[PDB]
């Protein structure tokens, strides 16, 4: 009955090979904003 951290969201201020996929990857370990 407990979570575990799978992602963390930071700002940019807190910071070429070949491409496997050419589009981006939306992980399941991310919340998706809701319209």
């Amino acid at each position: 009955a407990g979570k575990l951290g799978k992602f963390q969201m930071l700002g940019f201020q807190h910071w070429a090979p070949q491409k496997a996929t050419n589009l981006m990857v939306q992980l399941l370990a991310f919340y998706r904003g809701k319209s």
Partner: protein
């Protein structure tokens, strides 16, 4: 093991170098509070009075410049304490503090307990007047980080003398071939070299498919490779199917429980998959299905509010036999558990998980230990292949023979260009190959701990 690897598609690449793919998050975010200051700048503690008591301005120190000029942001209780921002962010070094008064008609002020460190704040909207309105609000973006994988180059070698060019096998015992299945099949070809290149494409199919599936990346935590070849360069190995799939949804156990398989396939796909997209098809062994059968059997025995009749489950079916007038049969199995809110779990027993030649640790309940491992390879649809077999475009395996005066494989008597002077013919073949799993969070595994991770 090879039927399982042909259930995945294949991608074509240009190089043998590293390849990368970039993952993305959302643009929408709430920000944790650091500190809240009253009208004259004095921090508010929990044992204080209310802060914005007479629609008086107060402060909110946030660890990042995220909010804008005239927006309305809300605390943990949305829409009850609406906070209109006044002016841009004053940077206290890296932090950002906003002048803020109450918005939604609150004439008693925000309580002191609603302004502590850790409280999250999210943007609602940026209102203005009807007359002579000025510019407010802003727009936020999001960025990608990258994932990374590389390749693995295998090789083979076999040597025969040059005497074996057309050596006819006078079969005292019948000469057999080793199949890909593992069966010794009989053959009747009288030449010896038919059983020499067949065992070297048997073995090269066994070398590739253990390099694609069973991978061990030998890049260090400091980004180095410690295993050096015979010539002096580093033997670089890229991860396989069964190393790329365990990096996100790690799960280990001793005792199987259905309540943690069901509340973890619902934690990851809670409001991200639709109701029709939650079919989670488990690949397992034959003995992993018996362990899954008992735990659903232990689950529906806790459903005491329902009674489970013979008339519907049909565990005692009537059969016809000579021994009796009304003779019975017996036997049942649970193969599917339908969770609340559309999540279904099905069993696909695959013969790959039960192979006792590679799987050597036995489970205490019989069978190999790899049989009790539950793998949900595909969670939802992805709009692109999640798991695919990386193969180089153009890198056909170099069939390469050096030989002397005879060549028993190609069957050539007389050589114009000799590599050396001995009756030999060696085969050298080599393949650069890897695999890639784009989203290892779309794949949930469940490994027995006796395999020791």
């Amino acid at each position: 093991l090879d039927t399982f690897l042909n259930s995945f598609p294949t991608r074509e690449f240009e190089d043998d170098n590293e390849y990368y793919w970039d993952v993305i998050g959302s643009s929408r975010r709430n920000i944790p509070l650091v500190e809240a200051r009253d009208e004259n700048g004095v921090v508010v503690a929990a044992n204080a009075a209310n802060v914005g008591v007479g629609t008086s301005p107060f402060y909110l120190v946030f660890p990042e410049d995220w909010f804008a000029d005239g927006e309305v942001i809300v605390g943990n209780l949305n829409q009850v304490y609406p906070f209109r921002i006044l002016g841009d962010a004053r940077m206290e070094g890296t932090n950002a503090v906003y002048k803020v008064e109450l918005m939604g008609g609150n004439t008693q002020g925000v309580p002191a307990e609603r302004l502590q460190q850790g409280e999250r704040f999210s943007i609602e909207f940026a209102p203005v007047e009807k007359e002579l309105s000025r510019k407010v609000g802003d727009v936020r973006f999001t960025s990608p980080v990258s994932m990374r994988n590389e390749w693995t180059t295998i090789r083979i070698q076999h040597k025969v003398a040059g005497n074996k060019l057309n050596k006819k096998l006078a079969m005292g015992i019948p000469m057999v071939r080793n199949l890909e299945s593992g069966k010794q099949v009989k053959d009747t070809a009288n030449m010896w070299m038919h059983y020499v290149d067949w065992e070297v494409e048997l073995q090269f199919d066994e070398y590739k498919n253990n390099a694609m599936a069973w991978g061990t990346s030998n890049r260090n935590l400091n980004g180095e490779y410690m295993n050096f070849g015979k010539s002096g360069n580093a033997i670089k190995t890229g991860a396989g199917i069964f190393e790329q799939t365990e990096v996100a949804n790690t799960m280990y156990y001793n005792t199987f429980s259905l309540k943690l398989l069901e509340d973890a396939l619902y934690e990851l796909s809670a409001s991200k998959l639709a109701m029709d997209d939650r079919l989670f098809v488990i690949k397992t062994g034959e003995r992993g299905a018996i362990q899954f059968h008992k735990e659903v059997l232990k689950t529906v025995s806790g459903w005491t509010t329902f009674v489970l009749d013979n008339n519907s489950t049909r565990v005692v079916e009537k059969v016809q036999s000579r021994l009796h007038s009304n003779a019975l049969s017996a036997g049942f199995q649970f193969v599917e558990y339908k969770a609340p809110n559309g999540v279904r779990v099905r069993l696909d027993v695959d013969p790959f998980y039960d192979d006792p030649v590679r799987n050597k640790i036995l489970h205490p309940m019989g069978g190999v230990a790899f049989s009790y491992r539950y793998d949900i390879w595909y969670i939802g649809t992805m709009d692109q292949p999640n798991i695919f077999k990386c193969k180089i475009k153009g890198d056909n395996e170099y069939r390469g023979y050096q030989w002397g005066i005879r060549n028993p494989f190609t069957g050539q008597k007389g050589n114009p260009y000799m590599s050396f002077d001995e009756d030999s013919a060696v085969i050298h073949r080599m393949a650069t190959l890897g695999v890639c799993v784009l989203d290892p969070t779309r794949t949930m595994s469940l490994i027995p701990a006796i395999l020791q991770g």
